[PDB]
Structure formats: structure tokens, C-alpha cells
Amino acid sequence: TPKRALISLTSYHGPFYKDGAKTGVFVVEILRSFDTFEKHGFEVDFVSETGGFGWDEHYFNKALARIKTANEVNASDYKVFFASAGHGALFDYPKAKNLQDIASKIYANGGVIAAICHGPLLFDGLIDIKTTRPLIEGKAITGFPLEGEIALGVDDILRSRKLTTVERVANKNGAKYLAPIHPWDDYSITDGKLVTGVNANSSYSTTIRAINALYS
Amino acid sequence: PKRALISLTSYHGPFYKDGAKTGVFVVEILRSFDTFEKHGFEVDFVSETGGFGWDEHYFNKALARIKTANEVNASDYKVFFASAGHGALFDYPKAKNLQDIASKIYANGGVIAAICHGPLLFDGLIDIKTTRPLIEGKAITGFPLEGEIALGVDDILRSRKLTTVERVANKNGAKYLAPIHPWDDYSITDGKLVTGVNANSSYSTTIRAINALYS
DSSP states (O other): OOOOEEOOOOOOOOOOOSSSBBBOOOOHHHHHHHHHHHTTTOOOEEEEEESSOBOOSSHHHHHTOEEOOOOGOOOOSSSSSEEEEOTTHHHHGGGGGHHHHHHHHHTTTTEEEETTTTTGGTTTTTTTTTTTBBBBTEEEEEOOOHHHHHHOOOOHHHHTTTTOOOOOOHHHOOOEEESSSSHHHHHEETTEEEEEESSSSGGHHHHHHHHHHHHO | EEEEEEEOOOOOOOOTTTSSOOOBHHHHHHHHHHHTTTTTOOOEEEEEEEEOOTTTOHHHHHHOOOEGGOOOOOGGGGEEEEESSSSHHHHHHGHHHHHHHHHHHHHOEEEEEETTTTGGGGGGOOOTHHHHHHHHOOEOOOOHHHHHHHTTHHHHHHHHHHOOOHHHHHHHTTOOOOSTTTTTOEEEEEEEEESSSGGHHHHHHHHHHHHTTTT
């Protein structure tokens, strides 16, 4: 009833670049999305699979300290699930079975699922409990392209560490992946109640699309 | 040469009412790594996921090179040292991969050590040689319940269905032996199983582990 959004973060705060900086959450995504939900009268909670997270070293507070474990969230409370990312999502989101039940339940409630950057990786095996089909099956989505990972010089890290891409998740789950012209473009999509965006540059636009999609 | 492996808790909180998060007590691993290096040992770190955080109440090479338990070659190491923080309360009991590494190091005549909440890692950790809980019929210390009550955190254990080192010892046919004060430097060597109470015991405990290797 009252206006509630949940933002999930990646719980993975570990080795990635090599280099030796730790990946994790990219603050700017969640800040911008935090602020936009707030400015639209939304109460915003954070959550991760384990309840933990850290900041991606290669670079509100109250809601952050008060972060729920996926275990201890009432999905019915929320009109919007917003999956933020950070290369950390490459490690946990596809296995984030608890977060996935949440988003599944919010969505089966006529809630919106939104995702940016690597956030759509959560969609891997994410089942739509009303239909029993992969939730993204037959949908168009966007998300951070392989091209962006080639640009950053971390695509070797992907094939070494056997990590996946949003495009692969799209294909694997019966969805159409649609790419931005450039990896850093403000780019997002509304497909019904499934809203996705590409990066931290799209965080504003994606959170607006999620809000709008509620009235649909 | 002679290689130690120090595991860190993977759980970066949240834990304290007051909204602070757990993770790993930095003091422990530093002193331990130092003492290990100080005695001729190459030290690597590991956590269940390869990740970690600093417990909010609060070398770099190895630490940059921190491993995920799944990628570790156990037979490489002579000593496994489980460092903690209250983060260990959430991952250590279900840290399947770190338990597997410790079991193999032990089965090969290496030492298992742990401090603080590190001994929670022993919860259903199997001595593969005897095929029973590694800590069965052993004496161990670890952060006592008295320390959790001193800290207020005992209702948290109750609410969150967490255990204590003492319950873990019980739950595995071990004897738990308490320090007088939860903050005493206190340590035990029981064969090649070596435990210590808290950060204050980090030095003692790693000294124990180094000595137990030659027993």
C-alpha cells in the first residue's frame, strides 16, 4: 500500500581486476537511484543475498546501515525491486536464489522488476512464479554489454573466472538482449513491468522507468 | 618452502544492533601473518568466496592475492590458520570449501589453528583420516559466550540461530576450555589442533601452530 522500493546490491566484495582492487557495488548507481525513488515519495530499503556488501575499489547511509539480508525481507512490502550491480554481481547475482524469490514475488504481485549494469544477471534462472517460465522469457532487456567489458580491459577476467554476460543470460533464458550504441550511454528499456538499463549513466532513467511502469 | 594459509571470514555483517557490520578483526591476521613470516613461512589468505570486509568496529600483497576457497591447492600448505571476527558466526559453520582445505592439510600432517570465532569452522569439519569430526575428543578454546554477553551480542546469537564455539565443541565431541576473562591471551595445543581465544592470543596461537608442526 504505502510506496516502497527495494534496491539489491551485490554481496560480493572480493578479487576481480587483478590488479588487486576489490570489486563490489558501484556507489553512484545506487545513490542516483536512491535519490530518485526518494524524490518520488518512495520508502527505499537495501538488501543483498547475504546482507553484506562492499564498495568497488575502482570506484542513504541510514538505509545502507539498515540493509536487510535477502533471508529477512517481506517481498509483499514492495512495489519495486531494483537490482543494482557492480562487477561484484557477476559473482553472486546468478546464484542469488533468495534475492530471486523476492523479485519473483514482487513481480507476481504486479510489482516492477528493474535492473541496471550487471543487475540483470539476477535474472538467470529467475522464475516467474505466476507462469513458471523464466521471468525474462519473451522480454527485451538491456544491461552492461560484453563490449563494455572489452573496453575496460576486464574481459580476460570474465573468461578466466568463468563469469557470464547479460547477453548470455538473455539468450539462456529466452530473452532478447538489446545493446546501447556505446557502453556508457544512458540507455534503458521498459518491457511491461520489466525495466532494465545499461550502467550508472542510465540509473536515473531506469529508476524513472520503474516508477512509470507501476502505472501500467 | 613452508606455507601457511590464513582464512578470513567472508561475511561482511550486518550484526550489531546499532547497524554496524561484522567482518574480520584485522589485528588477528596481521600479527599472525607477521609471526608466520617472522619464522620462515610464505603466507596466503583465503576466504570462502575470496571476498571479505573489515568488521566495522575496526602482507598487502598476499592480501591482494586473496584466494577463494575453491581455487586453493590444499596440499601446498603446512598450516591452516582460521582468523575470525563475528562475521565468522555466519559463514564459518557452512564454509564447506574452507573446511575441505583444512581437512586435507590436517590429513597430510599439517596443523589446523583458529582464533576467536575461528573454531566455528570446526562445526562438522571431518578428519578424513579417522572419518569423524576433526575436533572429536580434542580440547579447544575460542571466544567464550561470556565474551558475547560482555559485548551484549548474546540475544543476537539467540535471535539469529547462531552458535558459540562452546556449542560447536559440544556438537562435535570436543571439550571447550574457557579463559578466565574473555580477553585473556589464552591458547591450547592439542596435537596438531591449535586454538586461541581472541585477537590477544593471535601471537600465542600462531606460535603454537608453528611448534605443533614439528611435534
